[PDB]
Design an enzyme around this catalytic site. Sequence first.
Site, PDB file in Angstrom:
ATOM      1  N   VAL D  54       0.507  -1.399   0.007  1.00 20.26           N
ATOM      2  CA  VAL D  54       0.099  -0.323   0.101  1.00 20.26           C
ATOM      3  C   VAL D  54       0.950   1.250  -0.077  1.00 20.26           C
ATOM      4  CG1 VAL D  54      -2.100  -0.799   1.171  1.00 20.26           C
ATOM      5  CG2 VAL D  54      -0.764  -0.550   2.097  1.00 20.26           C
ATOM      6  N   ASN D  80      -7.267  -0.789   5.563  1.00 17.84           N
ATOM      7  CA  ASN D  80      -7.475  -2.088   6.997  1.00 17.84           C
ATOM      8  C   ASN D  80      -6.273  -2.024   7.077  1.00 17.84           C
ATOM      9  OD1 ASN D  80      -8.587  -3.822   9.216  1.00 17.84           O
ATOM     10  ND2 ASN D  80      -7.163  -4.950   7.832  1.00 17.84           N
ATOM     11  N   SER D 132      -9.033   3.711  14.681  1.00 20.29           N
ATOM     12  CA  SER D 132      -8.362   3.216  16.086  1.00 20.29           C
ATOM     13  C   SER D 132      -9.107   3.197  17.647  1.00 20.29           C
ATOM     14  CB  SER D 132      -7.116   3.080  17.051  1.00 20.29           C
ATOM     15  OG  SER D 132      -6.764   2.400  17.882  1.00 20.29           O
ATOM     16  N   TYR D 145       2.181   5.850  16.144  1.00 21.75           N
ATOM     17  CA  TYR D 145       0.631   5.025  15.815  1.00 21.75           C
ATOM     18  C   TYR D 145      -0.697   5.701  16.146  1.00 21.75           C
ATOM     19  CZ  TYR D 145      -2.914   1.467  16.047  1.00 21.75           C
ATOM     20  OH  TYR D 145      -3.611   1.240  16.157  1.00 21.75           O
ATOM     21  N   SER D 148      -0.377   8.507  13.052  1.00 18.70           N
ATOM     22  CA  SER D 148      -1.660   7.802  12.119  1.00 18.70           C
ATOM     23  C   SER D 148      -3.464   7.721  12.064  1.00 18.70           C
ATOM     24  CB  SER D 148      -0.745   6.986  11.981  1.00 18.70           C
ATOM     25  OG  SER D 148      -1.552   6.120  12.818  1.00 18.70           O
ATOM     26  N   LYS D 149      -3.537   6.946  13.130  1.00 15.37           N
ATOM     27  CA  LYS D 149      -4.850   7.400  13.588  1.00 15.37           C
ATOM     28  C   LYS D 149      -5.825   8.054  13.354  1.00 15.37           C
ATOM     29  CE  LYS D 149      -4.282   2.502  12.979  1.00 15.37           C
ATOM     30  NZ  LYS D 149      -5.143   1.920  11.774  1.00 15.37           N
ATOM     31  N   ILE D 177      -8.505  -5.837  20.247  1.00 15.08           N
ATOM     32  CA  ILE D 177      -8.780  -6.637  19.398  1.00 15.08           C
ATOM     33  C   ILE D 177      -8.419  -8.370  19.784  1.00 15.08           C
ATOM     34  CG2 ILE D 177     -10.688  -7.345  16.981  1.00 15.08           C
ATOM     35  CD1 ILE D 177     -11.786  -5.210  18.595  1.00 15.08           C
TER      36      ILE D 177
HETATM   37  N1  LIG Z   1      -5.654  -5.419  17.352  1.00 13.26           N
HETATM   38  C1  LIG Z   1      -5.998  -4.191  17.201  1.00 13.26           C
HETATM   39  O1  LIG Z   1      -6.566  -3.888  18.342  1.00 13.26           O
HETATM   40  C2  LIG Z   1      -6.959  -2.745  16.424  1.00 13.26           C
HETATM   41  C3  LIG Z   1      -6.458  -2.153  15.230  1.00 13.26           C
HETATM   42  N2  LIG Z   1      -6.668  -1.815  15.050  1.00 13.26           N
HETATM   43  C4  LIG Z   1      -6.600  -1.186  13.266  1.00 13.26           C
HETATM   44  O2  LIG Z   1      -7.147  -2.427  12.233  1.00 13.26           O
HETATM   45  C5  LIG Z   1      -6.287  -2.720  11.116  1.00 13.26           C
HETATM   46  C6  LIG Z   1      -6.149  -3.817  11.105  1.00 13.26           C
HETATM   47  O3  LIG Z   1      -5.162  -4.397  13.053  1.00 13.26           O
HETATM   48  P1  LIG Z   1      -4.617  -6.162  13.135  1.00 13.26           P
HETATM   49  O4  LIG Z   1      -5.182  -7.118  12.157  1.00 13.26           O
HETATM   50  O5  LIG Z   1      -4.846  -5.524  14.019  1.00 13.26           O
HETATM   51  O6  LIG Z   1      -2.909  -6.516  12.619  1.00 13.26           O
HETATM   52  P2  LIG Z   1      -2.533  -7.716  12.101  1.00 13.26           P
HETATM   53  O7  LIG Z   1      -0.757  -7.264  12.174  1.00 13.26           O
HETATM   54  O8  LIG Z   1      -2.465  -8.842  12.456  1.00 13.26           O
HETATM   55  O9  LIG Z   1      -2.790  -7.326   9.830  1.00 13.26           O
HETATM   56  C7  LIG Z   1      -2.039  -6.590   9.370  1.00 13.26           C
HETATM   57  C8  LIG Z   1      -2.557  -6.678   7.607  1.00 13.26           C
HETATM   58  O10 LIG Z   1      -1.862  -5.375   7.326  1.00 13.26           O
HETATM   59  C9  LIG Z   1      -1.087  -5.598   6.557  1.00 13.26           C
HETATM   60  N3  LIG Z   1      -0.534  -4.818   5.996  1.00 13.26           N
HETATM   61  C10 LIG Z   1       0.870  -4.217   6.664  1.00 13.26           C
HETATM   62  N4  LIG Z   1       1.936  -3.837   6.247  1.00 13.26           N
HETATM   63  C11 LIG Z   1       1.191  -3.287   4.780  1.00 13.26           C
HETATM   64  C12 LIG Z   1       1.889  -2.640   3.244  1.00 13.26           C
HETATM   65  N5  LIG Z   1       3.088  -1.976   3.500  1.00 13.26           N
HETATM   66  N6  LIG Z   1       0.932  -2.771   2.730  1.00 13.26           N
HETATM   67  C13 LIG Z   1       0.487  -4.357   2.247  1.00 13.26           C
HETATM   68  N7  LIG Z   1      -0.398  -4.786   3.319  1.00 13.26           N
HETATM   69  C14 LIG Z   1       0.356  -5.073   3.955  1.00 13.26           C
HETATM   70  C15 LIG Z   1      -0.280  -7.410   6.949  1.00 13.26           C
HETATM   71  O11 LIG Z   1      -0.482  -8.045   5.201  1.00 13.26           O
HETATM   72  C16 LIG Z   1      -1.338  -7.348   7.623  1.00 13.26           C
HETATM   73  O12 LIG Z   1      -2.663  -8.330   6.695  1.00 13.26           O
HETATM   74  C17 LIG Z   1      -4.853  -1.484  10.872  1.00 13.26           C
HETATM   75  O13 LIG Z   1      -5.376  -0.496  10.535  1.00 13.26           O
HETATM   76  C18 LIG Z   1      -4.479  -1.358  12.657  1.00 13.26           C
HETATM   77  O14 LIG Z   1      -4.073  -0.303  13.215  1.00 13.26           O
HETATM   78  C19 LIG Z   1      -7.300  -0.629  15.349  1.00 13.26           C
HETATM   79  C20 LIG Z   1      -7.703  -0.307  16.648  1.00 13.26           C
HETATM   80  C21 LIG Z   1      -7.664  -1.955  17.100  1.00 13.26           C
END
Ligand SMILES: NC(=O)C1=CN([C@@H]2O[C@H](COP(=O)(O)OP(=O)(O)OC[C@H]3O[C@@H](n4cnc5c(N)ncnc54)[C@H](O)[C@@H]3O)[C@@H](O)[C@H]2O)C=CC1
Lengths: 255, 255, 255, 255
Positions: D54, D80, D132, D145, D148-149, D177
């Site tokens: 991305v 996401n 977030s 972080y 960014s949010k 989560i």
């Molecule tokens: N896990 C949590 O408690 C929370 C997550 N979020 C947000 O939700 C979203 C998903 O988070 P999660 O599933 O927890 O994390 P995660 O690390 O498990 O999943 C992240 C996904 O982002 C993709 N990714 C990372 N860098 C990339 C790049 N340069 N190009 C393309 N894809 C890329 C990865 O391939 C992966 O599938 C994020 O934006 C995170 O900030 C917001 C609040 C809480």
Amino acid sequence: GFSDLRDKVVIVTGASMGIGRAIAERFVDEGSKVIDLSIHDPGEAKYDHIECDVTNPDQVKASIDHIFKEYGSISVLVNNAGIESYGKIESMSMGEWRRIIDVNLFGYYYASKFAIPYMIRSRDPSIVNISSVQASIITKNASAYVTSKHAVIGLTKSIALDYAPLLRCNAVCPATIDTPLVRKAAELEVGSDPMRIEKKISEWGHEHPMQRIGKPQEVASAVAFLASREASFITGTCLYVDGGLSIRAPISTPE
Amino acid sequence: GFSDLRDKVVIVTGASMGIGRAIAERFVDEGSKVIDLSIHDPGEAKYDHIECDVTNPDQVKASIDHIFKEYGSISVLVNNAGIESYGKIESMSMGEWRRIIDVNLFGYYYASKFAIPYMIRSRDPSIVNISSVQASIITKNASAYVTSKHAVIGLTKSIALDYAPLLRCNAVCPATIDTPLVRKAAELEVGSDPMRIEKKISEWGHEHPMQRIGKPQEVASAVAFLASREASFITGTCLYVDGGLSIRAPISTPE
Amino acid sequence: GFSDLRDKVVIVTGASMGIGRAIAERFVDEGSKVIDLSIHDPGEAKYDHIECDVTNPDQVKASIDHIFKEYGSISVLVNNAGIESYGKIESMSMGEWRRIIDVNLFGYYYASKFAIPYMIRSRDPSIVNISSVQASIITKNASAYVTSKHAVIGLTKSIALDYAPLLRCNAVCPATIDTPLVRKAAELEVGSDPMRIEKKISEWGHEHPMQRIGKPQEVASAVAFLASREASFITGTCLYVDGGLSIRAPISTPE
Amino acid sequence: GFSDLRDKVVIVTGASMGIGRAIAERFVDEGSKVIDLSIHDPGEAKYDHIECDVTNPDQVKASIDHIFKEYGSISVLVNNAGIESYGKIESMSMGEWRRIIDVNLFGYYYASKFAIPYMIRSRDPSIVNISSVQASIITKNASAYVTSKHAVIGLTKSIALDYAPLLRCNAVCPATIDTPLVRKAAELEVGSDPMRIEKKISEWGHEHPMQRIGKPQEVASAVAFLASREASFITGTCLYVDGGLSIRAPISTPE
Ligand SMILES: NC(=O)C1=CN([C@@H]2O[C@H](COP(=O)(O)OP(=O)(O)OC[C@H]3O[C@@H](n4cnc5c(N)ncnc54)[C@H](O)[C@@H]3O)[C@@H](O)[C@H]2O)C=CC1
Ligand SMILES: NC(=O)C1=CN([C@@H]2O[C@H](COP(=O)(O)OP(=O)(O)OC[C@H]3O[C@@H](n4cnc5c(N)ncnc54)[C@H](O)[C@@H]3O)[C@@H](O)[C@H]2O)C=CC1
Ligand SMILES: NC(=O)C1=CN([C@@H]2O[C@H](COP(=O)(O)OP(=O)(O)OC[C@H]3O[C@@H](n4cnc5c(N)ncnc54)[C@H](O)[C@@H]3O)[C@@H](O)[C@H]2O)C=CC1
Ligand SMILES: NC(=O)C1=CN([C@@H]2O[C@H](COP(=O)(O)OP(=O)(O)OC[C@H]3O[C@@H](n4cnc5c(N)ncnc54)[C@H](O)[C@@H]3O)[C@@H](O)[C@H]2O)C=CC1
């Protein structure tokens, strides 16, 4: 739709017209057993109705006690009954100011207070309170109304924190919605001419980024979502259904 | 200091102790003519005191009339009087719930209502309402209190919008401040043991990013600023004096 | 004024004109030793100036290192330098979009990052970041600008939480203020005719409840307050200096 | 379910695991045509996957072109993809700080920028950005972080305002989560011990009023709702899926 709502007992206050009627009808479409608590007979409706003034705690308690006995449970309570009259803090009588707080805030407090004991006897009960976009951005000459809608947010947060994780409580914050209250507000400004009324409403709609005012069914969709298990990890918040109104600054920029 | 506050007539409700007293004392230091409207006698004090129950409109109106006639104007009104008792919506009696709303919200409404006609005839009129950090992040078993503090924000915004540009109205949102109300809160929770109350207060302080609870004088500083001409383009907002509490998530991260 | 600011070393970015110049002059009036970091020579000014592009971290670091060596300490940092260009996400080049984030967000990040180590060597240091009312209510065709101002709030909260209780960090959120940037914005819409420019500005002013746009000195008062010990228990917040703009819904009501 | 999502083309970035994967899976269940744009291969999956970074605009643009040409439209874009690493503004390298902004903010900017021209030609276009709960209440040592949010919220509001009424744009603000990112967070704090990580996660869950951390599917429900026609009058807002975390003050009260 939200399948989980089918057959559940849902109480909606002020569901004899406007947003409340739209909410009641949506729950009926979802398959729920719906009961309106209001001071107006919706007439021929697919949902139940009990004459009930939300400012009367005894009548509210009696109506809810009756619903639990008749239906066996209460899973969702939608506090919606509300009124609005206009006036500067110096022009509106203290009585009218207090009456607005009584219906808009105390009505929600009474219905919630008497329904909760029964609701916690059901699985994943949910309360949805209708506040207003005016819990954030406000109108002039609406002191009591604005105060009451801010109060509703506090009550919502309190109920959510006090009863989590068993019961959830959230609010919906609508901007201008096509209802009797709004049609009335327009008339109070431009008269009864349907042509002038449409122009006034169109003006308000153009102030919203979506370029139109909302429809009752759109608020109902938000209520159904928050009442459902689809919102299982959502509690204590207000979902704004405002066509983007609350994020718009009225300052032009070069185009 | 703010030189414009000198000789200005300042009314502070609930100034016989705690935050209210600190606010009155600060304005006295600024050279203002200060009058406390409260039910308790502050005793030996650098400011005037008038026995007044903010929930009694006849008394509020008469006190404000006496102040205007004696002093010739009213430039600042600080609504501060407030109470707090605890209980879930199910345990607290309806009477006690209504009382908290009466003191915390209607008291602000009555004082504002009767003072405004006089204030708009005066110089740089400004009203400052004491809300709470709980207008945002809230505590458990405090339904009435939390609702009242959210209501105060709505009242604040409406007065601001309805009387701008002549009169400004803002709120101050404090987190934990060292006052009798907070001392009582700790006692009701950990008992009368002085050293245990001390521990409880310390704990609350450590929850604030500033690592301590606030001092009444720190709230007074914010109030004096908002009342002054220094805040001439500030209206309708809440200034948070919370040591960072409202922006802190209780979720640990790697160190 | 805020006596505690006298003789303290204060760095203000973008203080060669507009709000920044107003902030610098206010601190000079408070008796502070002020240094401007900007890309324009304010000419004859009572404060010091160092040519510095905030998007250049090396120049920012070198300028701050020099100030600490020359003055012996750094007590206050006011991040103010900022720009605004207009355009839909589809019309503005990716380069221009990024440049706005670079100045408006990264400039604040660099100045803060290099000043902090020195600031914590002083007593009760304070950082004040100038965001915008657009951290809440926004304008059209201002994608990059709006994004950057929201980002500034996040940075502000982070710095506040990461360095409390030693150092405080807050933001100021102004609405329309009479400055070169705003005069320019008006011209971009109506031309150079001072008569048409005043009409445009008057229009914007009438959109604010205060019925006028703000003055640079009014933003400066808020900055001085937050930078002073008068705000000792205030950290992580944004003080809105918006004439009530952020609390106004653009929906008429009967009058 | 939301019947209108059937056959709609849905793009989800970062859908190879965690929340992103749950979102893609939910849309697949709704009958949508789903494509994941991520750097990691999800392997066996019910939805399409395209290797895409991305932060590489050439790659993002080409992926979106391939999707539109192959599928004929693009109705929903869920931004996401995101990362998180920790450190105070003083310890984290500038390169790492910029990288977090690049993935978390610029990634959303690039995908939105290239998808919008196609989406506005499609049916009921809707963009949902994952922000977030930290767009409100934040954690320590997470400067980049958190910034960014908050930035994502600004981007969200601006797209909403600039493209209403044809296209809607909203954000979802999740608290803790159960995902690999959160598992990593715990590990970086308490080590690789599985049962200790378990304890850390449990602790975080108990900080949420709902008394547990959220599930990826719960975030997906909010996303599906906002993408659907059910949210037709909802734009420019953030729907908090936080189990009540953002409304909870960490201050105890009498029980
Ligand atoms: N896990 C949590 O408690 C929370 C997550 N979020 C947000 O939700 C979203 C998903 O988070 P999660 O599933 O927890 O994390 P995660 O690390 O498990 O999943 C992240 C996904 O982002 C993709 N990714 C990372 N860098 C990339 C790049 N340069 N190009 C393309 N894809 C890329 C990865 O391939 C992966 O599938 C994020 O934006 C995170 O900030 C917001 C609040 C809480
Ligand atoms: N129409 C709009 O644009 C907006 C409406 N709202 C809120 O949505 C709710 C519904 O509003 P509308 O449908 O527009 O108004 P409405 O006037 O059409 O409907 C109000 C309902 O309240 C009931 N009601 C009034 N006083 C009552 C009492 N003392 N006891 C029992 N029932 C009582 C009435 O019988 C009626 O069914 C209210 O809480 C209102 O403040 C919030 C934002 C915008
Ligand atoms: N102490 C704290 O941590 C916080 C206090 N606040 C608010 O600040 C204000 C002052 O609080 P505190 O000094 O802590 O409490 P306090 O109990 O020490 O002082 C309350 C004052 O209110 C007056 N009062 C109470 N009922 C009254 C009535 N019916 N008529 C007239 N005066 C009446 C009392 O005479 C007293 O002087 C309140 O509005 C409170 O809700 C907000 C946030 C935090
Ligand atoms: N004027 C207004 O109505 C509002 C202004 N603001 C903010 O207040 C701040 C000041 O705004 P104004 O005085 O109106 O604008 P301005 O254009 O008059 O002043 C900007 C200052 O920034 C400096 N600057 C610009 N790019 C720079 C760079 N790369 N390195 C160093 N210095 C640089 C300029 O030399 C100038 O002194 C900005 O952050 C702006 O976004 C926020 C809300 C409203």
